[PDB]
């Protein structure tokens, strides 16, 4: 019936049925969990006690995380008339007696997530891992902050709740390895992006400074780098350069060539770089992901043999396909599958005795048969082959960005807080008031969660920028809205654009070579697979 | 990776030990609990926390330790 519970000692051929299973769907056991010799000790019962109760540990992460939109604002505590809504949102505000029966319940199911692998790691294997030293420190922040929120700076609660939520969900922690491997490439091409705007704002400073453009908008070199930054984005487009155009028609040729270069060469050759360093970092992760299951297939091999010499016999192979509980008959497998091995030793007439023989054997079975069964349109195809593939294949590359917009919201709730008021006077002349944005706001956490969406789409993105630079008075409010741009021209060109290209080229490959392999041979080849993936 | 002249080694807490002995080194104990074959059992092993009790009994030594691929003898 059920083969999940077997930390209670299985046979030497029956303890194989998990480690050979855990290479198929790619799960992970800890290299410390495999570090013990038996691999059936108390360190293995207490990993299957995790991944079975693993829904109390992942839906807690949203009970943790979505307490941010259901918080208060940071700062109606100084201010006057909260309950009169000065353009605020819609959600309720949890009171302090409602944030204590919801931060203890969140922090009763988070220490039990963090101080659980002490039931399968030691007092010193645990504390030397640094995606584990952090997540103990993040909780002691939340345990200090619950202590502070019980008996009474800038309140770094809601940044930790993102950071726990990144480290806890595996794929967001795995995505963030790419972005920290991609980052040294991206800051170079960012450092040549700035040199495009720094140069082209200097000629635009120089050329227009006497005339009617460079007295109206292009006043000084600060407000031409600033304007020519927003023309890079295209979103500022004729409104920058009308009073150069109205006075000489020839100055469009500067500006119809700058935004020609700025969008079609440079923006694509930021996209081409960030898609070049996505190809390298992804396959660097797949080759770090292969060994997470290839180590399994040296722990699979290394329980079959008795004396550890490095061999399997032929009947010793056949005795384990019955342990697979997948295929019906015994002798029709190895008589067929050894021919399916491209490089068989044939040292004996029966056995093939190497460890890299078995390392691809137990992976070829999981593709051809697919018969485990645990009891417990042609014209529009290649698009929706990809469009259905992509909905869980971008949830780690669109959950990083949602955890970048949940950092900037919490910054933006605090840097730009209850400022757009209906009591305010310097508000009502900005572009927020005339376009009537005047919501899309930054006062609540889901007022400003949506505002960052509009800034992310880049639909009229400078209305918020040019209006918050006037409400805070500085020029330093600019830097919130330039840094959002830069990170999400990594993130919205890396993790989203460059992925949807190479995800189309794989549901191109599973449609083009499906016709080719249907006419090439009767069964699966392993050398065409190794050559076809090394082409696009 | 430090020996001690009943022989001990140092420092990967319980399964990071091979224990060896004109001659090339002959292996004696893998894991400091498992006598390798062909050899009399007057040499035994024991993991004692952060010490590795390699063991002389009868009268008639290059302990080993890795973590991932880099391996640390004694001397």
């Amino acid at each position: 019936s059920e083969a999940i519970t077997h930390g209670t000692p299985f046979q030497k051929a029956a303890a194989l049925v998990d480690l050979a299973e855990d290479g198929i769907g790619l799960p992970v056991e800890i290299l410390d969990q495999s570090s013990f010799g038996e691999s059936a000790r108390y360190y293995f019962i207490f990993t299957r006690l995790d991944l079975i109760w693993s829904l109390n540990y992942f839906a807690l992460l949203f009970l943790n995380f979505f307490e941010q939109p259901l918080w208060c604002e940071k700062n109606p505590k100084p201010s006057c008339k909260d309950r009169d809504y000065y353009y605020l949102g819609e959600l309720p505000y949890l009171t302090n007696a409602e944030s204590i029966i919801y931060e203890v319940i969140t922090l009763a199911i988070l220490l039990v997530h963090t101080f659980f692998p002490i039931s399968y790691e030691g007092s010193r294997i645990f504390w030397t891992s640094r995606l584990n030293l952090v997540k103990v420190a993040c909780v002691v922040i939340l345990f200090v902050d619950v202590l502070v929120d019980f008996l009474y700076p800038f309140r770094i609660a809601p940044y930790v709740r993102v950071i726990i939520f990144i480290l806890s969900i595996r794929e967001l922690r795995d995505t963030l390895v790419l972005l920290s491997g991609m980052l040294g490439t991206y800051l170079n091409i960012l450092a040549l992006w700035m040199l495009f705007l720094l140069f082209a704002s200097w000629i635009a400073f120089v050329m227009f400074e006497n005339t009617q453009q460079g007295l109206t908008v292009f006043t000084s070199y600060g407000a031409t780098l600033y304007q020519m930054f927003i023309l890079f984005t295209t979103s500022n487009n004729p409104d920058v350069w009308i009073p150069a155009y109205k006075s000489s028609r020839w100055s469009s040729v500067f500006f119809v060539l700058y935004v020609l270069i700025g969008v079609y060469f440079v923006t694509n050759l930021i996209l081409a770089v960030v898609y070049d360093s996505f190809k390298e970092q992804l396959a660097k992760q797949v080759s770090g992901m292969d060994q997470m299951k290839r180590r399994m297939l040296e722990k699979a091999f290394g329980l079959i043999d008795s004396d550890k010499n490095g061999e399997i016999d032929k009947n010793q192979c056949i005795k384990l396909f019955e342990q697979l509980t997948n295929y019906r008959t015994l002798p029709k497998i190895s008589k067929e599958e050894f021919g399916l091995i491209f490089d068989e030793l044939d040292d004996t007439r029966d056995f093939k005795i190497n460890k890299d023989e078995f390392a691809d054997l137990c992976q070829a079975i999981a593709l051809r048969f697919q018969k485990e069964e645990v009891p417990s349109v042609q014209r529009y195809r290649a698009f929706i082959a990809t469009f259905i593939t992509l909905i869980p294949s971008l949830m780690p590359y669109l959950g990083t960005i949602f955890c970048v917009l949940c950092i900037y919201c919490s910054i933006g709730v605090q840097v730009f807080g209850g400022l757009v008021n209906a009591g305010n006077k310097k508000l009502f002349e900005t572009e927020l008031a005339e376009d009537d944005y005047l919501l899309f706001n930054f006062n609540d956490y889901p007022n400003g969660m949506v505002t960052l969406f509009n800034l992310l789409v880049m639909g009229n993105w400078q209305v918020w920028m040019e209006s918050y630079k006037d409400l805070t008075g500085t020029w330093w409010s600019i830097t919130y809205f330039v840094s959002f741009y830069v990170i999400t021209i990594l993130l919205l060109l890396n993790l989203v654009v460059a992925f949807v290209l190479e995800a189309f080229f794989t549901e191109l490959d599973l449609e083009e070579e499906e016709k080719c392999q249907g006419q090439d041979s009767q069964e699966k080849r392993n050398r065409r697979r190794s050559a076809g993936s090394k082409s696009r | 990776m430090t020996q001690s002249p009943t022989i001990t080694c140092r420092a990967s807490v319980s399964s990071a030990v091979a224990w060896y002995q004109g001659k090339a080194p002959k292996l004696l104990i893998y894991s400091a609990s498992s006598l390798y074959s062909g050899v009399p059992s007057r040499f035994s092993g024991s993991r004692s926390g952060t010490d590795f009790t390699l063991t002389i009994s009868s009268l008639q030594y290059y302990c080993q330790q890795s973590s991932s691929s880099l391996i640390t003898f004694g001397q």
Partner: nanobody, 114 residues
């Protein structure tokens, strides 16, 4: 079956040699190789490892980048491109990742004088 090292000639400083680690007991992919040496009077020293299984050819701290290792599965030979006044040995751990504990390094070579 047991190990054969070759390539250990008479080396001058400056230039270097290229070793080889011959084998007949299926000693790549399964039983992978380790280069460990010993300068005279000293203890041993690990100088190069390899997986022909995992495709990882990794080696030490004090020789990192100096000494290059490669293989030949078809003749079961582990090459090694090279105060190195040493006596080189080969080795056959069954394990690769943590071969300290459970593999050991089972079969040691015959010896050389580099």
């Amino acid at each position: 079956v047991q190990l054969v090292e070759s390539g250990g000639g008479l080396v001058q400083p400056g230039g270097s040699l290229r070793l080889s680690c011959a084998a007949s007991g299926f000693n790549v992919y399964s039983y992978s190789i380790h280069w460990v040496r010993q300068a005279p009077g000293k203890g041993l020293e690990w100088v190069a490892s390899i997986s022909s299984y995992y495709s990882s050819t990794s080696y030490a701290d004090s020789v990192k980048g100096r000494f290059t290792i490669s293989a030949d599965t078809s003749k079961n030979t582990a090459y090694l491109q090279m105060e190195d006044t040493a006596v080189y040995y080969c080795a056959r751990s069954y394990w690769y990742w943590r071969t300290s504990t459970l593999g050991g390094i089972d079969y040691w070579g015959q010896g050389t004088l580099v």
